[PDB]
Design an enzyme around this catalytic site. Structure first.
Site, PDB file in Angstrom:
ATOM      1  N   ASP A 196      -0.695  -8.428  10.664  1.00 62.94           N
ATOM      2  CA  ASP A 196      -1.286  -9.135   9.541  1.00 62.94           C
ATOM      3  C   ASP A 196      -0.367 -10.263   9.088  1.00 62.94           C
ATOM      4  O   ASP A 196       0.816 -10.311   9.435  1.00 62.94           O
ATOM      5  CB  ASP A 196      -1.566  -8.179   8.375  1.00 62.94           C
ATOM      6  CG  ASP A 196      -0.303  -7.547   7.817  1.00 62.94           C
ATOM      7  OD1 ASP A 196       0.699  -7.451   8.557  1.00 62.94           O
ATOM      8  OD2 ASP A 196      -0.316  -7.140   6.635  1.00 62.94           O
ATOM      9  N   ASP A 225       1.609 -11.953   6.209  1.00 62.20           N
ATOM     10  CA  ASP A 225       2.241 -11.610   4.940  1.00 62.20           C
ATOM     11  C   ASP A 225       2.856 -12.872   4.344  1.00 62.20           C
ATOM     12  O   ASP A 225       3.789 -13.446   4.918  1.00 62.20           O
ATOM     13  CB  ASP A 225       3.292 -10.519   5.136  1.00 62.20           C
ATOM     14  CG  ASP A 225       2.693  -9.208   5.622  1.00 62.20           C
ATOM     15  OD1 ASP A 225       1.645  -8.790   5.084  1.00 62.20           O
ATOM     16  OD2 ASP A 225       3.271  -8.596   6.546  1.00 62.20           O
TER      17      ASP A 225
END
Lengths: 141, 141, 141, 141
Positions: free
Chosen positions: C35, C37
């Site tokens: 993901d 961040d």
């Protein structure tokens, strides 16, 4: 890559021993006609005895299907056909593509049992529309 | 191609979640920050509300733009372009996708002060969402 | 495809007008060293005035970054450096790669302000280990 | 390469979530099904517990198997292979990944009877998870 419905049907034969309480596996949603939407039908007897040694046996199906189908088990949504609404069972029978089936006519007996008529769906629509309209009136919008 | 009974089911759920969320509309920030239980209830309610709307938006767009992929944020904006939602509501309610991800993020660590603001946001904007989706279903006959 | 840190730095110049209250954008996590961040640092003045016309302005950053970086905004996790723990700010300053910065030395002033010494982290570890051990004793495991 | 203070923070959170979940350990199935509020609290607690464990497992595996990708289900199993978790605990707690996805699934529609079983599962297995991760951190010096 992403497996086709053909190899999903062949790989599903391994489920009889991995998921012994499984009686039917149906693919529905976007993948059939994105996430992987499967509908499962348990044998009511074997699942009850299986839960004694497995407190969360239902939540292990995505992990089992992921290792067998070689797909991301974090994108698998499971629907229990044993305890679901009559509305969900209707669309699973209407648009679903069966992947595993024991006996060979379980999906037909399922469709004949859960398929709703157009009039029955209209009655469901009327009740929910009245519920929505009542919500809108109470909230003043 | 749109199934109204599926959308009506989700709109009905949004109304039920909002009725429960309304019980927290008059809680002060201080009392909210001191109650971990009330934070968990509102976080779960806000997550179910936003996910139900995301489910509705994807169902509508899958029949208006078949094969096209939309992020949850861009899905709200796309409904505003086609006047299914008003452009004003679509822009104001689009950040609910960021609220959804924050509530389900692996890192978790959500700020209860920001969730407190989201309570007042949802109680004002999502009733309008229910109204406008309901009008779209009525227009669809 | 996935954008590199170089084009992320160039595309971040568009954020000054799209996110006017933004003062610094830092990439951390797996993408820097999955993901996405991001750690954001708001100007405390502009964000307060921005929230008056935007009740959920913080939750719209993932949608804005997604359209600018051409990345899936549903896989973006945002960390507010204005109101976060001292532990999160330490690792963001230690391993983060700055993408947007106004002025040109904001990331240096941030690192000098939030970086913890090895002794300070050891003291944090001792407190949390005592908390974990107390939990284990209370629960009898 | 593993940061113990990051793992200790998440273990500390799991302990706090379990202390709140323990308040529901003696609620009957009937009283639980009649209380929508108690269902929302336990669902949110179970979601935060499983996500914190997934966060710990990914951090450990990113330093033991850098670049390797693991599903949340296979991550628990991988920790059992390396004896970080016992193989018995890893197999019993691995279905928590399926519980996580069901709690965050877009379709939602989770069964409160299955969540009721997950309460007793988490109160028994996740304390053991905290103990075994804590022993791994102590072994790491």
């Amino acid at each position: 890559k992403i497996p086709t419905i053909a190899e999903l049907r062949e790989l599903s034969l391994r489920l009889l021993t991995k998921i012994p309480y499984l009686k039917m596996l149906v693919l529905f949603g976007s993948r059939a006609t994105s996430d992987w939407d499967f509908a499962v039908l348990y044998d009511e007897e074997k699942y009850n005895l299986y839960i004694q040694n497995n407190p969360l046996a239902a939540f292990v199906i995505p992990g089992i299907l992921g290792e067998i189908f070689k797909i991301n088990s974090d994108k698998i949504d499971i629907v229990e056909l044993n305890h679901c609404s009559k509305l969900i069972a209707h669309f699973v029978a209407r648009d679903g593509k069966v992947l595993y089936e024991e006996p060979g006519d379980e999906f037909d007996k399922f469709q004949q049992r859960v398929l709703l008529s157009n009039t029955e769906i209209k009655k469901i629509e009327k009740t929910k529309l009245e519920n929505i309209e009542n919500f809108l009136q109470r909230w003043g919008v | 191609n749109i199934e109204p009974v599926i959308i009506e089911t989700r709109l009905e759920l949004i109304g039920r979640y909002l009725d429960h969320l309304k019980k927290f509309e008059n809680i002060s920030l201080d009392d909210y920050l001191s109650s971990f239980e009330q934070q968990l209830i509102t976080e779960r309610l806000l997550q179910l509300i936003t996910q139900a709307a995301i489910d509705i938006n994807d169902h509508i767009l899958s029949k208006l733009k078949s094969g096209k992929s939309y992020t949850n944020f861009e899905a709200f904006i796309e409904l505003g372009k086609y006047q299914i939602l008003t452009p004003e509501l679509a822009k104001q309610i689009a950040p609910s996708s960021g609220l959804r991800n924050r509530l389900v993020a692996e890192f978790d660590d959500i700020d209860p002060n920001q969730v407190f603001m989201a309570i007042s946001f949802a109680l004002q904007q999502y009733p309008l969402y229910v109204r406008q989706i309901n009008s779209y279903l009525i227009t669809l006959e």
